Structure formats: structure tokens, C-alpha cells
Amino acid sequence: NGKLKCDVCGMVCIGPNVLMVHKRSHTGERPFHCNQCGASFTQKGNLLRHIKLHSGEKPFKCPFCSYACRRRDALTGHLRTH
Amino acid sequence: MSYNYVVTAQKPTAVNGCVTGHFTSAEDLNLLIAKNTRLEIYVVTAEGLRPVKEVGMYGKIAVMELFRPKGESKDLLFILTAKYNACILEYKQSGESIDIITRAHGNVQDRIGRPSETGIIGIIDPECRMIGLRLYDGLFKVIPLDRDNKELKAFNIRLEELHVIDVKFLYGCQAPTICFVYQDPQGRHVKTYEVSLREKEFNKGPWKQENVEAEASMVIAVPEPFGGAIIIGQESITYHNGDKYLAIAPPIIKQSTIVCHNRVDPNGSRYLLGDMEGRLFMLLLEKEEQMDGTVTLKDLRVELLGETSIAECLTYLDNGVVFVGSRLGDSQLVKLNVDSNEQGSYVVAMETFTNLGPIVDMCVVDLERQGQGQLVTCSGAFKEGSLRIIRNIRTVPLYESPRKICYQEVSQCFGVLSSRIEVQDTSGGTTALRPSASTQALSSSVSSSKLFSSSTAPHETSFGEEVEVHNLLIIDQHTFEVLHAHQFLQNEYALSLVSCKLGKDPNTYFIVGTAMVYPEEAEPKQGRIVVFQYSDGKLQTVAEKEVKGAVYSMVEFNGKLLASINSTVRLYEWTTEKELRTECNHYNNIMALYLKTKGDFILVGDLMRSVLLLAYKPMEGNFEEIARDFNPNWMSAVEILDDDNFLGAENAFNLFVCQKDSAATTDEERQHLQEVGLFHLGEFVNVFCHGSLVMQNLGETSTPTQGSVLFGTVNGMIGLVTSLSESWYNLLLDMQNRLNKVIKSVGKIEHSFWRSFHTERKTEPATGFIDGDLIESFLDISRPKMQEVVANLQYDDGSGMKREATADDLIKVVEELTRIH
Amino acid sequence: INFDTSLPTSHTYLGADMEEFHGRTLHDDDSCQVIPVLPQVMMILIPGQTLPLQLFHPQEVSMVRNLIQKDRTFAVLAYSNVQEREAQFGTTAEIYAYREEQDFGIEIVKVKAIGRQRFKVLELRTQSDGIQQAKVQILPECVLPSTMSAVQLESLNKCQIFPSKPVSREDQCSYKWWQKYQKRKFHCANLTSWPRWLYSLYDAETLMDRIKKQLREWDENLKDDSLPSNPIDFSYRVAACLPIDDVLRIQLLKIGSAIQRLRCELDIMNKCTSLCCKQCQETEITTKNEIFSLSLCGPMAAYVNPHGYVHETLTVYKACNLNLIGRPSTEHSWFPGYAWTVAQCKICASHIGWKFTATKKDMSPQKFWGLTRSALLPTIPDTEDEISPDKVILCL
Numbered sequence A: 001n002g003k004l005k006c007d008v009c010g011m012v013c014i015g016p017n018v019l020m021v022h023k024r025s026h027t028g029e030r031p032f033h034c035n036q037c038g039a040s041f042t043q044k045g046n047l048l049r050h051i052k053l054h055s056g057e058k059p060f061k062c063p064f065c066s067y068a069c070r071r072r073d074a075l076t077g078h079l080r081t082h
Numbered sequence B: 001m002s003y004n005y006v007v008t009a010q011k012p013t014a015v016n017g018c019v020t021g022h023f024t025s026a027e028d029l030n031l032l033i034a035k036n037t038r039l040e041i042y043v044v045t046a047e048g049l050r051p052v053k054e055v056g057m058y059g060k061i062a063v064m065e066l067f068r069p070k071g072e073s074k075d076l077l078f079i080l081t082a083k084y085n086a087c088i089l090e091y092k093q094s095g096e097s098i099d100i101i102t103r104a105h106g107n108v109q110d111r112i113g114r115p116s117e118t119g120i121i122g123i124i125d126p127e128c129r130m131i132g133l134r135l136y137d138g139l140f141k142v143i144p145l146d147r148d149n150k151e152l153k154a155f156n157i158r159l160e161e162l163h164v165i166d167v168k169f170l171y172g173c174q175a176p177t178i179c180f181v182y183q184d185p186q187g188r189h190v191k192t193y194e195v196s197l198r199e200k201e202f203n204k205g206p207w208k209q210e211n212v213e214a215e216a217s218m219v220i221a222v223p224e225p226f227g228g229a230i231i232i233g234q235e236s237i238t239y240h241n242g243d244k245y246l247a248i249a250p251p252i253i254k255q256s257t258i259v260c261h262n263r264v265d266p267n268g269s270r271y272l273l274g275d276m277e278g279r280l281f282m283l284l285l286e287k288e289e290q291m292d293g294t295v296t297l298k299d300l301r302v303e304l305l306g307e308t309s310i311a312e313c314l315t316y317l318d319n320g321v322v323f324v325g326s327r328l329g330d331s332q333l334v335k336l337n338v339d340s341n342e343q344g345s346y347v348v349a350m351e352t353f354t355n356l357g358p359i360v361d362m363c364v365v366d367l368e369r370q371g372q373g374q375l376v377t378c379s380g381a382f383k384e385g386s387l388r389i390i391r392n393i394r395t396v397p398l399y400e401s402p403r404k405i406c407y408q409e410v411s412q413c414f415g416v417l418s419s420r421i422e423v424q425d426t427s428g429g430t431t432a433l434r435p436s437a438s439t440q441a442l443s444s445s446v447s448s449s450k451l452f453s454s455s456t457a458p459h460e461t462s463f464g465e466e467v468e469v470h471n472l473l474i475i476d477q478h479t480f481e482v483l484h485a486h487q488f489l490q491n492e493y494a495l496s497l498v499s500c501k502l503g504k505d506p507n508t509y510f511i512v513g514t515a516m517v518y519p520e521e522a523e524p525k526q527g528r529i530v531v532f533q534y535s536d537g538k539l540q541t542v543a544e545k546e547v548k549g550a551v552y553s554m555v556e557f558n559g560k561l562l563a564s565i566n567s568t569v570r571l572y573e574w575t576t577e578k579e580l581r582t583e584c585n586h587y588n589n590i591m592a593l594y595l596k597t598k599g600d601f602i603l604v605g606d607l608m609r610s611v612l613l614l615a616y617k618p619m620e621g622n623f624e625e626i627a628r629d630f631n632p633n634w635m636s637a638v639e640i641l642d643d644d645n646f647l648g649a650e651n652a653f654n655l656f657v658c659q660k661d662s663a664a665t666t667d668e669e670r671q672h673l674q675e676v677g678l679f680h681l682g683e684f685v686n687v688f689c690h691g692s693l694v695m696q697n698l699g700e701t702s703t704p705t706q707g708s709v710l711f712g713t714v715n716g717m718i719g720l721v722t723s724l725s726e727s728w729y730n731l732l733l734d735m736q737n738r739l740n741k742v743i744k745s746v747g748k749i750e751h752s753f754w755r756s757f758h759t760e761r762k763t764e765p766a767t768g769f770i771d772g773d774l775i776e777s778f779l780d781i782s783r784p785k786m787q788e789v790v791a792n793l794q795y796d797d798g799s800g801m802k803r804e805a806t807a808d809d810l811i812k813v814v815e816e817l818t819r820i821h
Numbered sequence C: 001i002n003f004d005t006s007l008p009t010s011h012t013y014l015g016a017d018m019e020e021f022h023g024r025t026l027h028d029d030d031s032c033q034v035i036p037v038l039p040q041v042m043m044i045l046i047p048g049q050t051l052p053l054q055l056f057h058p059q060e061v062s063m064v065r066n067l068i069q070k071d072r073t074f075a076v077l078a079y080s081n082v083q084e085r086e087a088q089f090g091t092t093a094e095i096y097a098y099r100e101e102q103d104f105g106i107e108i109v110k111v112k113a114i115g116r117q118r119f120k121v122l123e124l125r126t127q128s129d130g131i132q133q134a135k136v137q138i139l140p141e142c143v144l145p146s147t148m149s150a151v152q153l154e155s156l157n158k159c160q161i162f163p164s165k166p167v168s169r170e171d172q173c174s175y176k177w178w179q180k181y182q183k184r185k186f187h188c189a190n191l192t193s194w195p196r197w198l199y200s201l202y203d204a205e206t207l208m209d210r211i212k213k214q215l216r217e218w219d220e221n222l223k224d225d226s227l228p229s230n231p232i233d234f235s236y237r238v239a240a241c242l243p244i245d246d247v248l249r250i251q252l253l254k255i256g257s258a259i260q261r262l263r264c265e266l267d268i269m270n271k272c273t274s275l276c277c278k279q280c281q282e283t284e285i286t287t288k289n290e291i292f293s294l295s296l297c298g299p300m301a302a303y304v305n306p307h308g309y310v311h312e313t314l315t316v317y318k319a320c321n322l323n324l325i326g327r328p329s330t331e332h333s334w335f336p337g338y339a340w341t342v343a344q345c346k347i348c349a350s351h352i353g354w355k356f357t358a359t360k361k362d363m364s365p366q367k368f369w370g371l372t373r374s375a376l377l378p379t380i381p382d383t384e385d386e387i388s389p390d391k392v393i394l395c396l
């Protein structure tokens, strides 16, 4: 159970000390960092997209057939085929 | 379950030990010979050797030395086995009953301890103070020679010199003194220690560390008159004694390394030296009275007596008669003359004891009787190499190394692969050492190919370097004369050889697999499959197929050619154009060294006991893996017993049997070969071969044994393996357990311990094998002990009963067993 | 070529000097043991390999305290399926350094352990505390004698020992000494049914020097000191710094004979010449020609980041198909004096590693690449002749 959640990056922590200490790594330009590689971002959504690219890493997935494409416009063109 | 039976057809013929002394009685002179597991005892006569007694031990004889303790009539015999079974035996005879009674025995193995690089070294004090054993690096085991010490209780002494090469007990010392050559980062040195049994430790030697030559390999203790020791290396021979240190570098010994010695005169004035290439020299120690009687060494001399068989061990008998024990060739009794002969040799051969030597390959051929078979083996190495025709021994000397052999009935002759060593000549070519079979051939030919003549790597060989030339000899089956000798390409090494008919072609060809071996190239990347045909007294090349690797093995596979090129098992077809056409490939995780086949099953193996079982799918046209078993251990040979059982020989002279589980439940267990047989054979198997040396018997009269697989070993021993039934197997196992109680073992070695599967890592009991020697020994014992064996034993003579077994029913059974070889 | 290969092995980025232990714990071969496993450890540990860890979770800190008080050994599971926590083999780790620090009001523990014994997993049993144990069976190290030790003649036993090594790069690289070595050691091959060059392929020392010839291509430190002489230690030290994927490393950990491990390592070093992106499987990142050793352990070593994640970093000279994200930084740099920049795949944006750029003009090399092993894939090179595609199957 992790009851303390960060407002800025949304990470889960165990005790209030961990959260307080975590909050100072933010103070600065591009405060959102990735723990896996250290990539900094200016907004939280970009960091979430990055950390998602770390896992399954499938870029633009189709919601109707599950095929992945390298680009957004390629996925749009594919979606127009269903 | 395995159920298998193994029996010795030919005892080990290679001599690895020989010592002279007074073992039977203090009067007459005795010669003891050690052939692996056999011990022969002769009496030295003026005519020759008189056979006195032959015994068999349950262990490989590593050390064998005679010694007469204080207050003993005749000499005692100390023997240590490979499994570290030490024992002191004594010769006792009552009227006409000879028995080698065990005065003492025990196992001297140390749980934990790295075996040394120079192997087991056993020495005894000249005055019989103790027995010194060097088994593991950094430790020196000592067995004190006390009348109380019956179990051979010994103690280790800390040895700071880890890398000890040779060690001896010195003569004429107040306290027992050992002198040994060792090596450290600064080179090799000779050092001495005083073994104190009271302190149970070492003490400063009479003359400590002295620097010796780089290749100093042999240490010889000189008797009382001289004292000190003699250190022999590659280029020089030195004598060290306290303050004096004499050294000579005779050029007559530089061409080869001296590997064995023996004392001629009991005072140490003369010694016999034998090198690797058969040369025999005489090392003389000149005396110097110094008037008052101190007798010091004056000088050292080496004189080339002559050439003998490649001597593993030497021993001077008497009156210029020397016994040469050989491992690579026949053993010899030779005479030393004073005046030499016209050629300049001082040695003259007297007797030639047959030694099947290292049996590297063999085959079974009917030849004359057209009924029972005979065994043709490639024996010996170098100038001792030969063929042996064993009947149920005809020697054909080749003077070069035979490797593979196959018989061709269509042409009434054999095809044999062989190799001869030549030396690089100043002109650029190579020169032979001696006229051998490949050189003294009726018809001759050389491979004139273009595959590698254009595709060759750049390199050059220096003068003096040795290079082996490979040849295929076509040899008559009647006269055994070299009809033809076909020499292969330069840097080409022939590995495999077969003789068979391929496809629709009615001709029978000699097919040879090769591999291009270059020095800078580690793993071979080039090779050939060459199909020859012998006709009209000439060998002509029918076909030539290049391959990207070494053709390790080949087998005839249902009219097709199954070859192995490194990791690939390939299947070729013989086209109507008389050419090899690739039809199938199977790439394995192991190196396809051993290739055997039975119908559609293929057995593949590598050097590390990685067994693999494939199958040819005819309807699909490709290979399929059936099962496998990978247990790391050095493997020497393999063979297919039946459709489900597979026999092999692995490290530590062991035999094993794997089994294919068919129609199981899980695919996982179906694809695994279970190890169903283990048995310490004591011999190094080099070739398995289906066949039998007895009359196959026309009228089939319910045979008790199924199958027959002969095998040849390095010590010349020939063995036979067969399959039994569960009932017969259980009966014979109970009978072995009963025989062990009544039989008397030399050295009191337990048969169970002797035949137990043994490696440096694990040592398990033997399973799935019946020791045929122990079973057949039942016929050579007294009748009261036979009754002891069959005491309260139930036997089945055919369906009903199930009755009390008599010694004679079992005698009938064992006589039936003895007819398989 | 003047960095200081002794700096990375110190792990100076972890802070003050740690408390060090001198005792050693080893379990009997084939014995059964119950050892705790660290939850967030995902690396495949090799005997002799150093593993650094930063533990923040209170459960992990408590477990490491208990370990420091007991035998100081935990189990590192070799996960075949990391998602579902499946494991059939593993390696034991012995903590040899630790530091227990209470910083800014939060308690954390830094640890340096080392791999000890391979083991087969018999049971994975997670207690009610959330921390799990492993019922384990220690796997024994199979030591085999010389392939000639059985057939060697007694007369030739005194001649098996060689008179020291040349240890002169040119003299040992010259194949004359190896011709001599093969002729001497495998003479008794004439007694068997195979030649000498065959046994040479199963010879511990021959394989070890063949591997040395490849390691000298990566580092200029002589084998006289840095490399071990024992075949077990040498094989493990080579396996620890081979950039292969987890399945190959698991198969290599399953090997129990140093001979087979050395042979498989040679085969891997000769076949896999390319290193591609694991997510792409086709995007080439680098080749074995660019691999170089910046640390004493070799080209590849394990390091821990500020948040406890462990990356097996491989140092290479040049790399392609990589986009740099952000600007260099020296914060928590595993290579003191260099600044790191996050590197992604040009195609998939996988974190492939970082680009290290020197901070001083006098440093050499001025720039290199540290690639995390988890994101690389070993690959064979496409043949120059497309018509000839012989089988390049894994060989051992």
C-alpha cells in the first residue's frame, strides 16, 4: 500500500519523508525526470509518454485491430481502411 | 533397465611395468612384468624366461616395486593401483600350489587433493624404512614399514614445492633422504629432504637446492659406492653428490628425450637409457679409488648401444640379456654384445613377445573358413605400427602408424589409412626417416587435385620440423602385401574411411574423408570426400567433393553416404553421373565426431560425452531429432547395441549404456536418454565393432546371449559385450555377489569397489553390467567352494523347477557362456 | 587512452567508503539451502561479478540488515519470464560492502555484493511480509582432468610440464610456440582414434589464450596480471563482460564445465559481430570492433543509478542510429570526468544507453558510448555473398 502520491509526477511513496525529499528533485526547469534513463521533460504528459515508450514501446497502436505504425499519419491512413 | 554382459577375449598385452629381483626364492632370479591388470612372474634362466605364475588384480597397476625388509628371507612386492589401493604381497608355494598371499593392504586415497601433473610416484627407502608416495601436489604421503602396520596407515607431510617432477630415495644416508627435481618461476632445481618418522616431518637435506637444466626430467639414485644422484634432462646428464657436481652434454642424446632407465651393475657403474624413438644407450660411471678407499666418481660417458622397440620400461636380467617392455610395439628380449656387428649395433634381438599395442581401429572378416570370423586390427604406432590378424598372432609390420581399416570383399583386399613422419629438408621438401609401407608399395600415386592448390594459405615450414604424410594403402587379404599406396594432398589429414556400394552403382568404392590442417588455422575449414575405385591393381579417383570442414566420420546409410563435417551431419546421394549430391543437412549443437547408424536411426556424439539420437524421415526428406543426453565427460568411443540401447566408453576407463524411452507420456522425457548402465572396465576403448570370433552356429539352438560387440583398447585388450534377459541378469548378479565371498582377491581389493564407476568428481556403483571374467572364474575353483556358491540357491532349468541348484548345473551354464568368445 | 581503468570498479559515485567484510561463506555442493531474494533485482548474476545496489524500501533495508547480521548471502534469480517472476536457475550473492545512512530524514542502504555459487531453483516461497525465500540446490563446478590424462604414458609424464610461458606479446602471438604446445601436450593423441588439433579444441589453456587474443583486442592490459589463470575463474570473468541477451546468458549460466563455457564464449565472440536494438531486432547500433575496455573488469560492468536501477553498461567507441536527448550532465556519472547524455534508438526511441563526453580537453578518449545490455541484441553479420548463407547456429 502506497498512500502518499506526488502532485507533480504522481509517483507513489511509502512515507512522508520520501515524498518530501522527492519534491526537491522537481524544483527546476524540466522537473519531470525518468528514473530509468534520466530524461528530463517540461511537462508530466511527455514524461508519461516516454516511460510508456520504455515498456511495450509500441508507438501508435490501432484501437480496432492492434496493428502498430511508426507515425501518426500512417496510423490515420490505416484507420481509414476499417 | 539395461541387462548386459562383458567378457575379456584377449588379456592386455601392453607392458607398462617390469622389475627384477628375488621374489619367489632368495636363490633364483625373478622378472615381474605388469600388463595393466595382469601380473606375470618369470624365473631368469640361462636360456631365456621360465613362466612361473600369472595373476590378475582388481585394479590398474600403477606402482610395482620389490623390497626385502630387515629380517626377511626373500623379497616382498609393493603394488599400488590407479584407485589408490596399496598392498604388500609375498610369494608362497606349498608343494605344487602357488599362491600370492597378501601380507598387507589398504586404500591410501585422500578425500580432497589435486592429483599431480607427473602422475603417481611411488618409491621405497633402500633400507626399507618407509614407502614414499607422491599422489597429490604439495603433499608427500609416507607409509612406515613397521611389522605392526598391517592396514598401511600413512601420514602426509607438507611439501612446499608444489610442482615436483621426479623423486627418488637416496643411498648411503644416515636418515631416509629424498632427492627430487621441481620447478618454480625461476626454473627447475634439485632439492633434498630428510624424512623423520619420529617428528613425522621434513628436515634439511644433506645438500639443499641446486639449479638444474630447463628440461631436467629424470632422477636416479646411485648405490652406496658412488652415492648422490643423477639428473637427466633433454641435452645434458649431471651427477650431484654433496659438494661435487659433474655435468656432460653428449650430442648423441640430443635428438630425442631419454624417458626410461635401469641399473646394470649393482654398484652403479653402468646404467641403461632408453629414448622415445627406441634408441638404447649405456651410461657409464668411471670409478676413482683415491687410495684409502673413498671411491669417488671420475667421469661420465654415454655410448649408443643400438635400437630396440619403443621402450616404456627397461630391466637388465643377466649376462648381457635385457628385457625391453614396450607399449607402442612388441616386447623384446635382446642381447648386448661386446664387439657389435658390421652395421655398428651392439644390440641383437632374441625374443619378440606379441603386443597388440594401441588398437586404434579394427574390423571382422571371414577370410578363409567362410564360416567363423577373424579380427584384423591396426596396432602399434610409428615404426612399431602394424596389422594383427587374430584367429580363435599373425603380424604384418608396416613401420608406420596405421589409423583406420576396412575390408572390401569384391576386390579381396583391405583399405587402410596410415601416416608416416618425415622431416623438413634444407632443399625445401621432406625426407623420410625409414622405408615404411607407404614408401615400399608396388603401385603408387599422389592426389593431383585443384580444390586447394589454388585455395591455399600463405605459410612456410622451417628446416628440421616434423610433418606426417597420410596415405591410403590397398593391401592383399592373403599375402598382406602393399598392393597400392595413394598419398594425399599436402597438409591433408585423413580421418574417416568406408567401403560400400552407393545407389544404383554396382561398383564398390573406397570412400575417404579428409580435412585440411594448417598450423595457423585452429578449427578446420576445408576438407574432401574422395571416392576411389581399386581395379586392375590400380587405385583411381572416381569422385571428389569439397566440404567447408573436417569429415570426421562417415557411414553407409541405406545406399546413401552419411558424413559429418564439423557441426553438420550431411546426407549425400550417389547420382547417375557418378558424383556426390547433397540431399540432407542437420546442424547440431555438438561436433559430430562419433557417427553410428542402425536402419533409420543415427547416433551422433562429440568428445565430451554429448549423446544425440536423430532419425531420417523418408517421406519428408530431412532429419529429425529423437532424443539426447548431455553429461560433460571425456568420451572415447560409442556404438549402437540395439534400437533402444547405446553403448559408449567415457573417462576413467568406464563403460556406460544409455536407453531411448519410447512411448512415454511427456515429450520432455521422451527426448531424454536415461543412463541405464555403468561399469568400470579398466581399459581405454578406441573402437567398437559388431561381430564375433566364434562359429555363428547354423542350427539356431536358443542362444542365451543376444548381440555381439567386440572392442579394442589401448593396452591391446580385446573385449566382448552382449545382451542378456532380466532373469539371466538377476541370476548372474546374485552369482557374482556369491562368488565375491569365496574368491580370493590379490591385494584384498573388493570387486564391488574395483568395478564401480569412478571419476575424479563422482564414484557410483556399477549397474547394468555382468563381469564376465568373474563369472567364468567359477569353472577354475574347487568343488567345495562351488558348493558354497550354490548353497541355498534356486535355479530354473526350463519352465518347471525352480529347484535347488547344483554346482554342475551352474558349470553347464558357465560353459555355455564361455562359448561366446 | 589515459582515463584510469581502476575508477569504474571503485563505484566512487556511491559516496563515502563503505564498511567492508573479510569473511566468506560457501555452501556445500548439491546441498539444499533457503536464501532470501531481493524483490526489485532483475539482473542475471554471474559468479565473480560485482553487483552494486541502492535500497530505499524499508522491507529491503530490513532484509539487508538481517543479512549483514547472518551469512550476508541473498539469491539473485535468473528470470526466464520477468513479468510473471519465473525462474529455474540463479546465482548467490555475498554482500562484501555496505553503508547504512539516514539522509534528509529517510533511511537508505548501499551495498556491494559479489556472485558466488550457481544454483537450481527448487521453490520460490513469498512470505506474508512480501519478502520471498528460495529453496535452492547448489550446482557443482565440474572440473575435468586433461583429455590426455587417462592415455598419457608413464614415461612421458615427466615431459608434460612446460618450461614457463613466453609472455612476450609477439612471441606468443606467433603460432610457432602454439605448434610446440600442441605437439607436446597432445602427443599421446597417437594412442587414441583422433588427432591433436581435435583435443586442442577442448583444452582449457588453448581456449583461454584464444580468448586472451580477443580480450587484448579490447584492452591493452597484459594477461600477466589482470587475467586469472584458473579455468573456472577465467570462464566466469569472460562471461561477465559478454554483451548477450538474457536467454543466451541463462544458457551460459547453465553450463557446469569450464571447458564448455570457454568454448561457448569463444563461439559467441566469433559469431555475434553486430549489436542491434533489442526492440527493433534489425536496427544496428554497434559492432564488436568498437568494443573497448574502460574498466579493469572489461568492456562491460554493472552500475547502479540514483534510484536503484542497475544497468550493465558496455563501453564502445562508436555507435549509430542513436538520438541524443537533452544536454550532457555529470550528475552521478559512472565514469568520473565524463558527462552523460541519454541516447535513444533513432527508429524506436528505446533507451539504448548514454553518450559520455569528456569534460577536459586533455582526456582521452574524448567521447564514447555506454549501452545498457538489456536493450541490445547480439547478431551475426549478413554475409558479403548473399548466395552463401551457411548455418550460424549457436555452438558449444
Ligand SMILES: Cc1ccc(NC(=O)CCc2cccc(NC3=CC(=O)N([C@H]4CCC(=O)NC4=O)C3=O)c2)cc1Cl
Residues within 6 Å of the ligand: A018, A021, A022, A025, A033, A034, A035, A036, A037, A038, C056, C304, C305, C306, C307, C331, C332, C333, C334, C335, C340, C354
Ligand atoms: C530516492 C531518490 C534518489 C534520487 C533522486 N533524484 C535525483 O537523483 C535527481 C533527479 C533525477 C531523477 C531521475 C534520475 C536521475 N538519475 C539518473 C538516471 C540514470 O539512469 N542515471 C545514469 C546516467 C548515466 C550514468 O553514468 N549514471 C547514472 O546514474 C542518472 O543519473 C536523477 C530522488 C529520489 Cl526521491
Ligand SMILES: [Zn+2]
Residues within 6 Å of the ligand: A006, A007, A008, A009, A010, A011, A022, A023, A026
Ligand atoms: Zn513528483
Ligand SMILES: [Zn+2]
Residues within 6 Å of the ligand: A034, A035, A036, A037, A038, A039, A050, A051, A054, C351
Ligand atoms: Zn527513460
Ligand SMILES: [Zn+2]
Residues within 6 Å of the ligand: A062, A063, A064, A065, A066, A078, A079, A082
Ligand atoms: Zn483497426
Ligand SMILES: [Zn+2]
Residues within 6 Å of the ligand: C277, C278, C279, C280, C281, C283, C345, C346, C347, C348, C349, C350
Ligand atoms: Zn530500435
